[PDB]
């Protein structure tokens, strides 16, 4: 099936963005982590906390 | 053919934030990638060409970069009029192919809707159909629950909703819910009500009228 | 304009197709004029439409 | 100014034929590539075909090869798309664009698009009904009123207010496909309550596919 992974992007200055990744569960997962690694190059190391069986992520950037 | 994979599918951020959307080519496309914006029912607008060059007249807050087969479009200070669909496109090989698009939405403070209701017009009632319209004006966020009750009977399957594009200036939405009945059914009942649930409202709001009231 | 004997052949084939209506027939003929490099592909799609309307 | 203007879209039955035109001005198509790009309702952009008018070289998407042909007349500065053996999935807005103009290797100018609808259903003009302002459409000293544009086919319908003189506070909702297979939409505008009965409000509805022009005066009941 196609699922939607919802992500909170929480930046070190407290700003919050939200994003959605869609695909198979495994594709959307990989895309979310890929996007985190990309943003981390500018926003600092990320940590991904997974909720709802992996269908929601809280991704914090260290700054 | 070359595939262009865009992510995220939806990104929501506040006015003034820096936002980054990405586009991955399935094989080498050199720098032959352009970015287009599409909004307000208009035609696509060129923002960036050859991966990193800003097209004339495009605001300087837009920038693009390339790393191998990974391409990025960054808006350095998001503005309300930047809500749009964004598409990347490669021209390295034929067919030129587009990414499937990323939608950027603006985050803003909560705003409860103004709720209005419109009975069917007497002109329409002269035909055999009755349309009752519930209007939610200028609210945020987009999520809202609109339920119809006819003589206190919850209605199901006989209404349709339509939502406007996020407003270019204040980033709100407006929504219509239209209940459709036969004239015979409409003239059979008295109380027509739409009940609106929304994050900005401290409890649900019901707007209603009695058929025949002025 | 003028045509070689291959283009003339493609016209003839579409002109004679019995199951096309006249809008379709002339639309395909127009395509043959539009882009001679597509003559084979245009003829193939004309044949497919003709057969589907038998 | 560079400009491209598409024309020729309309309603066609499956298996039918249509010819689109793309009239260019402010530049010579002999100097650029010309592309057709289409967009199904609510979906993304899909490349259709291109031509280089100086030498007639053409390329096509696999999904349209043999059914569509692209061509150009440089003496009229116009490109064309002949569309045969049309199918429901060809329903889309068709844009034309240029590429390589002024040395820019991207599609820097696009037309406004022309809508192609492939369907067995018949054209039907809309009925326009008032959404009259009332005590149930007013709060805080402002009032909402509108026009309901019901039961038309195919798309599109455009609505203006007071011949374009009234634009602030207008919400024209996207059209909805009803269960009947016909479309409907509403356009609403919010105005000062004190203006009701002194300021005339008219919605100007145009459904060109059926040659329908309706000007509806909306007043309190």
XYZ file of C-alpha atoms in Angstrom:
552
model
C 0.000 0.000 0.000
C 0.944 3.682 -0.154
C 1.399 5.400 3.201
C 2.119 8.932 4.354
C 4.903 9.483 6.867
C 4.376 12.775 8.717
C 7.498 14.499 10.046
C 8.019 17.331 12.509
C 11.255 19.163 11.707
C 12.409 20.846 14.921
C 15.314 23.225 14.506
C 17.793 24.305 17.152
C 16.345 27.830 17.324
C 12.920 26.346 18.081
C 11.409 26.854 14.633
C 9.169 23.983 13.531
C 8.314 22.859 10.002
C 6.264 19.839 8.983
C 6.663 17.567 5.996
C 4.994 14.537 4.452
C 6.680 11.668 2.611
C 4.596 9.239 0.558
C 5.302 5.851 -0.987
C 5.535 2.354 0.314
C 6.359 2.396 4.009
C 9.977 1.501 3.227
C 10.317 4.106 0.455
C 8.777 6.887 2.532
C 10.992 5.939 5.483
C 14.151 6.065 3.371
C 13.096 9.403 1.845
C 12.448 10.946 5.276
C 15.873 9.882 6.565
C 17.523 11.076 3.343
C 15.861 14.476 3.756
C 16.994 14.679 7.386
C 20.606 13.978 6.392
C 20.409 16.694 3.754
C 19.031 19.297 6.164
C 21.579 18.274 8.798
C 24.415 19.547 6.601
C 23.082 23.074 7.175
C 21.166 22.700 10.442
C 23.421 20.354 12.415
C 23.256 16.710 13.433
C 19.762 15.237 13.478
C 18.050 12.789 15.805
C 14.920 10.998 14.600
C 12.368 9.850 17.162
C 9.795 7.481 15.707
C 6.185 7.199 16.857
C 3.087 5.380 15.587
C 4.966 2.308 14.344
C 7.300 4.504 12.290
C 4.496 6.475 10.563
C 5.336 9.708 12.417
C 8.801 11.113 13.048
C 10.106 13.926 15.215
C 13.411 15.030 13.672
C 15.475 17.429 15.816
C 18.524 19.276 14.493
C 21.329 20.168 16.889
C 22.240 23.499 15.274
C 14.265 7.388 -19.489
C 15.402 9.453 -16.501
C 13.252 9.603 -13.354
C 13.137 12.742 -11.183
C 12.122 12.016 -7.572
C 11.026 15.058 -5.541
C 10.711 15.230 -1.770
C 9.051 15.979 0.473
C 5.621 15.732 -1.136
C 4.330 18.455 1.220
C 6.334 20.937 3.293
C 4.770 23.487 5.671
C 6.713 26.367 7.212
C 6.245 29.804 8.744
C 6.708 33.136 6.987
C 10.379 34.065 7.117
C 11.642 30.484 7.478
C 14.258 28.904 5.241
C 12.817 25.984 3.287
C 14.575 23.350 1.232
C 13.060 20.937 -1.266
C 14.913 18.275 -3.190
C 14.942 16.490 -6.509
C 16.916 13.312 -7.247
C 17.772 12.190 -10.784
C 17.859 8.458 -11.459
C 21.149 8.864 -13.364
C 23.620 11.618 -14.239
C 21.953 14.723 -15.689
C 24.954 17.058 -15.292
C 23.459 20.473 -14.347
C 20.543 20.209 -16.817
C 17.802 20.772 -14.222
C 15.263 23.599 -13.948
C 12.795 24.511 -11.211
C 9.272 25.806 -11.857
C 6.682 27.326 -9.537
C 2.957 26.892 -10.156
C 0.248 28.618 -8.123
C -3.043 30.584 -8.223
C -4.315 28.478 -11.170
C -1.555 29.953 -13.366
C 1.022 28.566 -15.768
C 4.371 27.243 -14.518
C 6.931 29.973 -13.809
C 10.662 29.403 -14.321
C 12.661 30.100 -11.147
C 16.045 28.362 -11.581
C 17.754 26.962 -14.678
C 20.916 24.875 -15.152
C 20.621 23.778 -11.490
C 21.797 27.017 -9.882
C 21.115 30.112 -12.010
C 18.356 32.528 -11.065
C 16.074 33.528 -13.922
C 15.693 37.253 -14.551
C 13.063 38.872 -12.360
C 12.866 35.995 -9.849
C 13.296 37.181 -6.232
C 16.766 36.637 -4.832
C 15.394 34.516 -1.968
C 15.247 31.578 -4.415
C 18.440 29.560 -4.951
C 19.355 26.152 -6.317
C 22.287 23.794 -5.917
C 23.518 20.413 -7.165
C 25.428 17.560 -5.521
C 25.869 14.679 -7.949
C 22.347 13.585 -8.888
C 20.787 15.480 -5.950
C 19.292 18.908 -6.633
C 17.953 21.399 -4.096
C 15.721 24.450 -4.298
C 15.980 26.730 -1.266
C 13.751 29.670 -0.346
C 15.743 31.651 2.174
C 12.877 33.679 3.717
C 9.508 32.160 2.940
C 6.808 34.608 1.907
C 3.023 34.073 1.853
C 2.940 34.410 -1.929
C 5.421 31.511 -2.143
C 2.702 28.948 -1.391
C 2.733 26.862 -4.555
C 3.577 23.607 -6.232
C 7.253 23.349 -7.219
C 8.480 21.102 -10.053
C 11.947 20.106 -11.164
C 12.671 19.091 -14.765
C 15.718 17.527 -16.460
C 16.608 18.207 -20.111
C 19.745 16.045 -20.207
C 18.016 13.308 -22.241
C 14.844 13.010 -24.271
C 12.147 12.729 -23.032
C 12.628 15.651 -20.685
C 10.986 14.549 -17.464
C 9.418 16.326 -14.508
C 9.416 15.530 -10.840
C 5.987 14.830 -9.391
C 5.962 18.105 -7.454
C 6.370 19.417 -3.923
C 3.621 21.510 -2.374
C 4.745 24.318 -0.005
C 2.160 25.571 2.463
C 2.461 28.511 4.895
C 2.127 27.907 8.641
C 0.491 30.741 10.587
C -1.472 31.442 13.753
C -4.815 29.749 14.306
C -7.882 31.647 13.071
C -11.456 30.498 13.635
C -13.758 30.727 10.597
C -16.704 33.006 10.076
C -19.637 30.626 9.506
C -22.554 31.579 7.255
C -25.419 29.619 5.735
C -27.470 30.199 2.574
C -30.886 28.587 1.945
C -31.726 27.614 -1.638
C -32.875 30.530 -3.755
C -36.506 30.741 -4.799
C -35.265 30.693 -8.411
C -33.617 27.295 -7.898
C -36.634 25.958 -6.006
C -38.673 26.634 -9.159
C -36.639 23.754 -10.602
C -36.701 20.416 -8.826
C -33.550 20.725 -6.707
C -32.466 22.534 -3.530
C -28.868 23.501 -2.740
C -28.001 24.637 0.796
C -24.575 26.237 1.200
C -22.508 26.472 4.384
C -19.535 28.841 4.135
C -16.447 28.886 6.384
C -14.519 32.068 5.676
C -10.848 32.905 6.223
C -9.653 30.299 8.714
C -6.457 28.446 9.614
C -5.521 25.605 9.720
C -7.256 23.902 6.805
C -8.642 21.013 8.887
C -12.322 21.451 9.710
C -15.355 19.240 10.259
C -18.664 20.350 8.731
C -21.740 18.240 9.433
C -25.242 18.768 8.112
C -28.367 18.148 10.177
C -31.867 18.272 8.676
C -34.538 18.316 11.386
C -31.700 17.147 13.681
C -30.994 14.090 11.496
C -27.292 13.796 10.709
C -26.863 13.835 6.926
C -24.506 11.477 5.116
C -23.565 11.169 1.456
C -25.499 14.183 0.126
C -22.954 16.996 0.571
C -19.695 18.038 -1.115
C -16.905 20.321 0.129
C -14.665 22.719 -1.785
C -11.682 24.631 -0.334
C -9.881 27.648 -1.777
C -6.149 27.881 -2.355
C -4.269 29.302 0.620
C -4.623 33.084 0.492
C -1.704 34.952 -1.087
C -1.609 37.620 1.645
C -2.984 36.233 4.927
C -2.480 32.490 4.309
C -6.042 31.542 5.313
C -8.450 29.069 3.690
C -12.140 29.299 2.910
C -14.448 26.327 2.557
C -17.919 25.680 1.179
C -20.110 22.703 2.023
C -23.116 22.236 -0.284
C -26.043 20.024 0.697
C -28.141 18.926 -2.298
C -31.731 17.699 -1.992
C -34.744 17.323 -4.216
C -37.238 20.164 -3.909
C -39.750 17.618 -2.597
C -37.377 16.576 0.203
C -36.409 20.168 1.004
C -40.061 21.188 1.400
C -40.654 18.143 3.643
C -38.359 19.357 6.447
C -37.979 22.542 8.482
C -34.597 22.995 10.214
C -31.382 23.064 8.157
C -28.149 23.336 10.124
C -24.420 22.996 9.498
C -22.245 22.375 12.536
C -18.611 23.469 12.266
C -15.773 22.054 14.379
C -12.412 23.809 14.131
C -9.293 24.222 16.258
C -9.871 27.973 16.603
C -13.385 27.534 18.043
C -13.737 26.830 21.758
C -16.666 24.529 20.923
C -18.533 23.622 17.715
C -20.584 26.316 15.990
C -24.010 25.589 14.507
C -25.510 27.892 11.879
C -29.093 27.114 10.941
C -32.320 28.391 9.430
C -35.952 27.329 9.239
C -37.323 26.845 5.737
C -39.586 29.779 4.958
C -38.180 32.158 7.581
C -37.129 35.590 6.351
C 2.858 21.014 -51.126
C 4.320 18.097 -53.088
C 4.782 14.513 -51.920
C 6.966 11.520 -52.701
C 5.377 8.171 -53.538
C 5.697 6.952 -49.923
C 3.698 9.856 -48.499
C 1.149 9.412 -51.291
C 0.918 5.752 -50.252
C 0.160 6.662 -46.631
C -2.568 9.118 -47.665
C -4.169 6.455 -49.893
C -4.226 3.909 -47.058
C -5.978 6.243 -44.619
C -8.279 7.616 -47.326
C -9.585 4.088 -47.970
C -10.091 2.941 -44.352
C -13.782 1.935 -44.178
C -14.465 2.293 -40.434
C -13.115 5.791 -39.767
C -15.506 8.708 -39.700
C -14.596 11.772 -41.742
C -13.327 13.767 -38.751
C -10.902 10.966 -37.902
C -9.887 10.354 -41.515
C -9.023 13.999 -42.131
C -7.342 14.336 -38.738
C -4.984 11.474 -39.570
C -4.376 12.836 -43.066
C -3.520 16.180 -41.458
C -1.018 14.439 -39.167
C 0.705 12.900 -42.213
C 1.131 16.389 -43.658
C 2.180 17.845 -40.285
C 5.128 15.540 -39.593
C 6.298 13.220 -42.383
C 8.833 11.596 -40.014
C 5.865 10.097 -38.117
C 4.178 8.513 -41.150
C 4.649 4.914 -40.001
C 3.464 5.641 -36.443
C 0.464 7.680 -37.667
C -0.576 4.911 -40.056
C -0.305 2.328 -37.287
C -2.560 4.319 -34.979
C -5.010 4.938 -37.823
C -5.150 1.182 -38.447
C -5.725 0.498 -34.755
C -8.618 2.961 -34.635
C -10.059 1.577 -37.871
C -9.954 -1.985 -36.539
C -11.494 -1.013 -33.188
C -14.461 0.539 -35.027
C -15.169 -2.467 -37.279
C 7.349 41.143 -24.456
C 7.563 37.432 -25.214
C 4.142 35.801 -25.265
C 2.647 32.435 -26.212
C -1.118 31.946 -26.575
C -2.697 28.502 -26.938
C -6.092 27.973 -28.534
C -8.235 25.158 -29.873
C -8.990 23.160 -26.730
C -12.488 21.840 -26.182
C -14.694 18.820 -25.577
C -14.104 15.779 -27.831
C -15.524 12.276 -27.749
C -13.117 9.357 -27.237
C -11.617 8.470 -30.604
C -12.062 12.041 -31.844
C -9.670 14.674 -33.191
C -8.684 18.198 -32.111
C -6.094 20.704 -33.341
C -4.358 23.083 -30.939
C -2.507 26.252 -31.950
C 0.274 28.127 -30.131
C 0.653 31.700 -31.426
C 3.962 33.306 -30.496
C 4.829 36.997 -30.379
C 7.763 39.105 -29.228
C 10.230 36.507 -30.549
C 10.640 34.230 -33.572
C 9.980 30.524 -33.102
C 12.639 29.983 -35.764
C 15.130 30.819 -32.995
C 13.954 28.386 -30.297
C 12.495 25.001 -29.535
C 8.734 24.873 -28.982
C 7.291 22.301 -26.577
C 3.842 21.063 -25.622
C 3.417 20.120 -21.943
C 0.162 18.914 -20.419
C -1.323 18.701 -16.938
C -4.225 16.486 -15.936
C -6.598 18.084 -13.397
C -4.924 18.079 -9.999
C -1.812 16.236 -11.234
C 1.694 17.147 -12.346
C 3.332 18.268 -15.562
C 3.905 15.773 -18.392
C 5.974 16.509 -21.497
C 4.127 15.846 -24.770
C 6.275 16.861 -27.773
C 8.796 19.361 -29.112
C 9.850 20.824 -32.444
C 12.773 22.921 -33.657
C 10.998 25.028 -36.310
C 14.210 26.011 -38.141
C 14.804 22.407 -39.279
C 11.556 20.565 -38.460
C 13.117 18.080 -36.023
C 10.427 16.637 -33.730
C 10.283 14.340 -30.687
C 7.279 12.805 -28.928
C 6.316 11.234 -25.632
C 5.764 7.494 -26.025
C 2.190 7.846 -24.767
C 1.188 10.064 -27.721
C 3.444 8.872 -30.583
C 1.429 8.283 -33.750
C -1.720 9.835 -32.286
C -0.415 13.425 -31.964
C 1.763 15.407 -34.380
C 3.555 18.678 -33.691
C 4.273 21.164 -36.451
C 5.134 24.798 -36.944
C 4.498 27.513 -39.522
C 7.298 30.056 -39.184
C 5.588 32.534 -41.539
C 2.748 32.735 -38.975
C 5.050 32.300 -35.941
C 2.671 29.563 -34.774
C 3.072 25.946 -33.669
C 0.374 23.282 -33.721
C -0.577 19.991 -32.096
C -2.864 17.691 -34.076
C -4.513 15.239 -31.690
C -6.155 12.106 -33.088
C -7.507 8.903 -31.532
C -8.085 10.816 -28.304
C -8.609 8.978 -25.025
C -10.049 9.969 -21.661
C -6.560 10.062 -20.132
C -5.603 12.764 -22.644
C -7.917 15.139 -20.720
C -5.629 17.945 -19.552
C -4.602 21.535 -19.827
C -2.173 21.759 -22.756
C 0.571 24.379 -22.427
C 3.011 25.436 -25.067
C 6.413 26.727 -24.062
C 9.681 27.823 -25.624
C 13.127 26.462 -24.797
C 16.520 27.853 -25.718
C 15.225 31.389 -26.185
C 17.889 34.060 -25.616
C 20.244 31.220 -24.654
C 18.211 30.079 -21.638
C 18.190 26.284 -21.507
C 14.835 26.057 -19.737
C 11.170 26.768 -20.442
C 11.202 30.453 -19.597
C 7.855 31.394 -21.187
C 4.615 29.413 -21.186
C 1.170 30.098 -22.557
C -1.939 30.299 -20.410
C -2.946 26.778 -21.480
C -5.952 25.421 -23.357
C -8.202 22.746 -21.852
C -8.879 19.471 -23.694
C -11.716 17.303 -22.349
C -12.160 13.786 -23.737
C -15.576 12.489 -22.739
C -18.759 11.014 -24.173
C -20.872 13.451 -22.148
C -22.628 16.375 -23.815
C -22.022 20.088 -23.355
C -24.409 21.678 -20.858
C -24.690 25.320 -19.865
C -24.959 26.277 -16.200
C -27.784 27.672 -14.117
C -26.798 30.678 -11.981
C -28.554 31.183 -8.668
C -28.101 33.965 -6.119
C -26.605 33.383 -2.687
C -28.448 36.340 -1.219
C -26.998 38.190 1.783
C -29.157 37.829 4.877
C -29.031 37.952 8.671
C -27.502 34.452 8.366
C -24.540 35.615 6.226
C -23.392 38.651 8.243
C -21.181 39.229 11.263
C -19.002 42.037 12.564
C -20.500 44.534 10.124
C -19.590 42.621 6.957
C -21.890 40.488 4.819
C -21.280 37.538 2.503
C -23.175 37.006 -0.734
C -22.485 35.045 -3.845
C -23.579 33.106 -6.889
C -24.075 29.361 -7.208
C -23.147 28.180 -10.726
C -24.738 24.765 -11.074
C -24.799 21.796 -13.461
C -22.432 22.549 -16.362
C -20.119 20.494 -18.577
C -17.328 20.610 -19.481
C -14.982 22.882 -17.584
C -14.285 25.758 -17.235
C -16.513 28.447 -15.729
C -15.132 31.873 -14.864
C -16.787 34.318 -12.460
C -16.088 38.010 -12.005
C -17.881 40.552 -9.818
C -19.121 43.922 -11.093
C -17.293 43.402 -14.404
C -13.961 42.986 -12.606
C -14.334 46.161 -10.539
C -14.824 44.113 -7.348
C -11.932 41.773 -6.538
C -11.193 42.261 -2.835
C -12.821 39.662 -0.590
C -13.864 37.391 -3.471
C -13.602 33.617 -3.031
C -14.408 31.640 -6.170
C -14.289 28.008 -5.165
C -12.832 25.260 -7.386
C -15.493 23.469 -9.371
C -16.706 20.148 -7.999
C -17.772 17.138 -10.056
C -21.214 16.126 -8.836
C -22.590 12.587 -8.747
C -24.622 13.518 -11.841
C -21.381 13.965 -13.779
C -22.005 17.727 -13.990
C -19.901 20.438 -12.395
C -20.851 23.167 -9.983
C -19.102 25.937 -8.123
C -19.903 28.937 -5.987
C -18.288 32.360 -5.936
C -18.731 34.450 -2.782
C -17.719 37.972 -1.827
C -17.641 39.693 1.569
C -18.726 43.354 1.597
C -19.637 46.037 4.139
C -23.089 45.339 5.548
C -23.903 49.048 5.163
C -23.400 48.712 1.389
C -26.272 46.257 0.866
C -29.038 47.896 -1.137
C -26.976 50.920 -2.188
C -24.103 49.176 -3.984
C -25.110 46.870 -6.830
C -23.442 43.447 -6.833
C -23.511 41.377 -10.038
C -21.667 38.122 -10.685
C -20.556 37.769 -14.312
C -20.575 34.071 -15.227
C -19.017 32.819 -18.456
C -19.243 29.219 -19.687
C -17.631 29.529 -23.102
C -18.063 25.807 -24.039
C -21.827 26.436 -24.220
C -21.569 30.134 -25.226
C -23.226 31.033 -21.903
C -22.848 34.578 -20.534
C -24.970 35.318 -17.449
C -24.911 38.516 -15.355
C -26.778 37.865 -12.099
C -27.772 40.692 -9.764
C -27.612 39.512 -6.148
C -29.672 41.398 -3.579
C -31.155 40.724 -0.132
C -34.466 38.883 -0.040
